[PDB]
Amino acid sequence: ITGRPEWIWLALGTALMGLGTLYFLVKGMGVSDPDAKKFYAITTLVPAIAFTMYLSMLLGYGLTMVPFGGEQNPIYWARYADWLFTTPLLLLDLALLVDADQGTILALVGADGIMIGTGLVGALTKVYSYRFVWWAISTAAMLYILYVLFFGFTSKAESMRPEVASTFKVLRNVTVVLWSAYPVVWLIGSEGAGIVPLNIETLLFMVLDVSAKVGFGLILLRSR
Amino acid sequence: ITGRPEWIWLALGTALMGLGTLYFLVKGMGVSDPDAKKFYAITTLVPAIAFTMYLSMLLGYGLTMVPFGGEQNPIYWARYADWLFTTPLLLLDLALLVDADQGTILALVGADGIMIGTGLVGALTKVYSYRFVWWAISTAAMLYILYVLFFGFTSKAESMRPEVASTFKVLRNVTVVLWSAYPVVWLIGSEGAGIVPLNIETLLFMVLDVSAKVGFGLILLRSR
Amino acid sequence: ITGRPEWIWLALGTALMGLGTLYFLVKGMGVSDPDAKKFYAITTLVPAIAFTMYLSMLLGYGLTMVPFGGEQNPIYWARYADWLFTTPLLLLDLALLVDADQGTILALVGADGIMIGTGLVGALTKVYSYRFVWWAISTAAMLYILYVLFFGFTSKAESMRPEVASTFKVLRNVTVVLWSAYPVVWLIGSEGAGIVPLNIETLLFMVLDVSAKVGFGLILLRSR
Numbered sequence: 001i002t003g004r005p006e007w008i009w010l011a012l013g014t015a016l017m018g019l020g021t022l023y024f025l026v027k028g029m030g031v032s033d034p035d036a037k038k039f040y041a042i043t044t045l046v047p048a049i050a051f052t053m054y055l056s057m058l059l060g061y062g063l064t065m066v067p068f069g070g071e072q073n074p075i076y077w078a079r080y081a082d083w084l085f086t087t088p089l090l091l092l093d094l095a096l097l098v099d100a101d102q103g104t105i106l107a108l109v110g111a112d113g114i115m116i117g118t119g120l121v122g123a124l125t126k127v128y129s130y131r132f133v134w135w136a137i138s139t140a141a142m143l144y145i146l147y148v149l150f151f152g153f154t155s156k157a158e159s160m161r162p163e164v165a166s167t168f169k170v171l172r173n174v175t176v177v178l179w180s181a182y183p184v185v186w187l188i189g190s191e192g193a194g195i196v197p198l199n200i201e202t203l204l205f206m207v208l209d210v211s212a213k214v215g216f217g218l219i220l221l222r223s224r
Numbered sequence: 225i226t227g228r229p230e231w232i233w234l235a236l237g238t239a240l241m242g243l244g245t246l247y248f249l250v251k252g253m254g255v256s257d258p259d260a261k262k263f264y265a266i267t268t269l270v271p272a273i274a275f276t277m278y279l280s281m282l283l284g285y286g287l288t289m290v291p292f293g294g295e296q297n298p299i300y301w302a303r304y305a306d307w308l309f310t311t312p313l314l315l316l317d318l319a320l321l322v323d324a325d326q327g328t329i330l331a332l333v334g335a336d337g338i339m340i341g342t343g344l345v346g347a348l349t350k351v352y353s354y355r356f357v358w359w360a361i362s363t364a365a366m367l368y369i370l371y372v373l374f375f376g377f378t379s380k381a382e383s384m385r386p387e388v389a390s391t392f393k394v395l396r397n398v399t400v401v402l403w404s405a406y407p408v409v410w411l412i413g414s415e416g417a418g419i420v421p422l423n424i425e426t427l428l429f430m431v432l433d434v435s436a437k438v439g440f441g442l443i444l445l446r447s448r
Numbered sequence: 449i450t451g452r453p454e455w456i457w458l459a460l461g462t463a464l465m466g467l468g469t470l471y472f473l474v475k476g477m478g479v480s481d482p483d484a485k486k487f488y489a490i491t492t493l494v495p496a497i498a499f500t501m502y503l504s505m506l507l508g509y510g511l512t513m514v515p516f517g518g519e520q521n522p523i524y525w526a527r528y529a530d531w532l533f534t535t536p537l538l539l540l541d542l543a544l545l546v547d548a549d550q551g552t553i554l555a556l557v558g559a560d561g562i563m564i565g566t567g568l569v570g571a572l573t574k575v576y577s578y579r580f581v582w583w584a585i586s587t588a589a590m591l592y593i594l595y596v597l598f599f600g601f602t603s604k605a606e607s608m609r610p611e612v613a614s615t616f617k618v619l620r621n622v623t624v625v626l627w628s629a630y631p632v633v634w635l636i637g638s639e640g641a642g643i644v645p646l647n648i649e650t651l652l653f654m655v656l657d658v659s660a661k662v663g664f665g666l667i668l669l670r671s672r
């Protein structure tokens with residue numbers, strides 16, 4: 001509803017983000033190869049930070065009251081804090097893996113940058129119609145990322161060790177399906193056009209969350 | 225006045241930032257040399273981001289009401305968001321071009337960092353007299369950048385290919401004149417001591433804007 | 449009390465941060481070795497930025513009124529702005545010195561990132577009990593940094609020139625004692641459980657401040 005009905009999923013989300021955190025920490029202990037160590041460090045802040053956000057979200061600090069088209073709607077801007085950080089870090093996990101030219105890395109981060117950032121302003125507009133105007137400009141941002149990811153990073157990927165190629169594909173396909181889920185979820189949800197209730201919203205991004213970060217966590221890190 | 229008289233220039237500014245964006249995007253398509261690709265990626269986020277800011281500025285989100293010395297004055301803090309990002313990216317375009325030692329790059333970004341950042345606090349102070357105290361400290365910041373730019377980057381520049389040297393000078397001279405324009409513009413303007421009206425302010429930074437980013441865009445990117 | 453009793457220490461803190469700034473600036477003038485230049489640039493933004501924060505803190509902008517457990521308490525969020533920037537830069541001074549693998553650098557910055565960041569949310573919670581919940585999670589963050597600093601960076605350090613080893617130890621030991629002081633100071637202080645008055649708080653972080661940045665300034669920079 002606005003800080004009480006989904007206290008559950010939230011709690012559930014904190015337990016999951018942080019468990020995943022304690023796990024990695026107690027899994028990179030060994031690590032000799034500095035090369036892989038990178039992946040580790042990265043593939044760990046993500047859950048950690050993710051944990052801090054899902055925690056303030058539960059306790060309260062998370063939400064805020066954005067006024068749009070009639071009544072006062074809930075907006076865990078706390079998410080965006082997270083996504084603003086995680087999402088880049090993730091891309092790097094990808095670029096870094098498939099050794100991408102800094103050129104594309106850079107354009108890729110900034111692409112994501114404008115995406116999430118704008119996703120925030122979207123979920124912070126008072127004028128009801130404008131909310132979607134950013135939704136638009138933002139998606140355009142994502143379709144960009146996914147494009148120059150599923151095209152390039154595929155090629156370069158599939159031009160080295162069989163290890164990389166395959167693994168890349170794993171995450172790559174997941175990332176695409178997973179990620180894409182958002183625009184819609186956001187939409188049907190209370191942050192955009194309120195179709196489903198917050199009882200849902202929370203739980204949707206909740207699953208997409210633990211799966212994208214810890215999914216991409218076990219999946220990635222547990223590969224050569 | 226405060227969101228209505230300059231709706232024009234604003235609209236005009238959005239059309240220009242974004243047009244420049246679509247242009248680059250459809251101009252880096254080819255690009256084989258990863259070296260130059262860097263320039264591209266960079267020389268593109270700038271307009272893009274620039275576009276997003278000038279857009280929220282028009283629709284509304286842009287402005288805010290800062291209270292100083294009597295009445296309530298307008299402050300498109302939205303600009304600063306932009307400048308906070310563009311300006312560094314630009315410097316990198318410069319440093320990167322004239323292959324500058326990370327040492328100076330770093331000190332240069334942070335120099336700009338303190339500049340824009342402080343330019344914000346300046347344009348956010350309630351006590352009328354203090355506004356200028358930051359104006360001061362801030363300018364000091366710029367004079368720093370321009371100094372260690374027009375001095376160093378000139379030398380190193382003029383010690384390679386005739387291409388670089390000349391091009392550097394192009395942008396370098398523009399950057400200096402252009403950039404400098406601000407301190408004054410800001411001043412005469414409503415964000416500092418209100419001399420000219422917002423009918424102007426907007427339109428001034430508007431021109432200095434499209435010219436600095438897209439100016440530096442065509443100018444730069446269209447060179448070897 | 450809340451912007452008047454400690455106007456002193458504050459003023460004193462500004463004078464010190466900025467003096468240290470003018471000093472470095474007029475001490476890196478020479479510098480031929482690009483390698484060391486890095487240290488310089490870094491070891492300078494720190495004081496500079498530090499100066500800007502301690503200045504807005506004195507003039508006013510600094511503080512804010514956070515409501516927790518009864519009455520309205522003061523919170524120079526301005527600090528956190530500072531620490532959020534300085535602290536990383538410092539670590540880099542360390543990592544960079546003892547040539548640490550980017551892997552650890554990265555995990556180290558993000559470690560600090562979550563630390564300060566969370567230290568803020570801590571000092572921004574309304575519910576009195578939660579304030580300490582972040583205090584906890586945050587410290588955990590620091591103990592992390594100090595751990596993987598006093599362990600690793602020691603080893604790698606002590607495996608090169610006698611210069612480095614010794615110097616590292618200097619700063620390293622200082623950093624540890626100094627840094628640690630905070631959690632407690634914060635605690636006994638008004639930002640956490642209000643034991644001592646703001647007459648103190650200010651002056652404590654004031655000393656720990658000028659000593660950590662300018663301490664680590666002269667100490668570091670004045671070594672081979």
Ligand SMILES: *C/C=C(C)/C=C/C=C(C)/C=C/C1=C(C)CCCC1(C)C
Nearest residue numbers: 086119138139142179182183186212
């Ligand atoms: C851990 C979090 C992850 C992997 C988040 C991914 C998020 C997105 C792809 C979000 C996309 C959005 C839009 C395309 C439109 C505006 C709203 C957003 C930010 C939810």
Ligand SMILES: *C/C=C(C)/C=C/C=C(C)/C=C/C1=C(C)CCCC1(C)C
Nearest residue numbers: 310343362363366403406407410436
């Ligand atoms: C695309 C935007 C560009 C190139 C902006 C450049 C802006 C400046 C050089 C701004 C300077 C300012 C001061 C020197 C004093 C405080 C106010 C500012 C931020 C307008």
Ligand SMILES: *C/C=C(C)/C=C/C=C(C)/C=C/C1=C(C)CCCC1(C)C
Nearest residue numbers: 534567586587590627630631634660
């Ligand atoms: C120039 C500033 C420096 C070196 C600051 C260092 C600050 C810390 C180690 C702060 C630590 C904190 C906690 C461990 C708990 C939450 C409160 C903080 C941010 C004061």
